[PDB]
Amino acid sequence: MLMPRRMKYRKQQRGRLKGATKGGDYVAFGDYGLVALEPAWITAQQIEAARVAMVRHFRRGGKIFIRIFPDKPYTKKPLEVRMGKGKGNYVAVVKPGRVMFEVAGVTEEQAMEALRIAGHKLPIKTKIVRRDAYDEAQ
């Protein structure tokens, strides 16, 4: 689905969405990227919604990178009220300026119209990008 195997701890505190993406952010694997303009918990099921929209969009062809991963467990109570925490029930924290997704090996006009679909499945505003000198060398 997308999810770790093996966790150290089952549940973990919410924390803030403060700041800028802190890495990720420079477009390392592909010809075109999708970058986050807003912070959000992006869900294993939103990610896979986007991934499939793109493969469906081209031919089973192309190449797709993803590059954000849902390692943060997301609890919810049932309709109860208050005794303990839990349960269940996975997100990836995503700050502004991060490259998620990022396709390659496809025509610009394909990638861009697929990346546009892809971001319609996301809770945040997004930006399509290309690739650069600015994405350096390393």
Q: Which residues bind RNA (CB under 7 A)?
A: 4-26, 28-29, 38-41, 43, 45-46, 48-50, 52-53, 56-57, 65-69, 71-72, 74-77, 79, 81-86, 93, 117, 120-123, 138
Q: 129 touches which of Mg ion, other proteins, RNA, none (CB within 5 to 8 A by kind)?
A: other proteins
Residue 82 DSSP symbol: S
Residue 24 DSSP symbol: S
Q: 72 touches which of RNA, other proteins, Mg ion, none (CB within 5 to 8 A by kind)?
A: RNA
Is 39 within 8 Å of 96 (Cβ atoms)?
A: yes
- Minimum distance of other proteins from residue 29's CB (angstroms): 11
Q: 60 touches which of Mg ion, other proteins, RNA, none (CB within 5 to 8 A by kind)?
A: none
Measured from the Cβ of residue 1, the count of other Cβ atoms closer than 10 Å reads 8
Is 83 within 8 Å of 50 (Cβ atoms)?
A: no
Is 40 within 8 Å of 132 (Cβ atoms)?
A: no
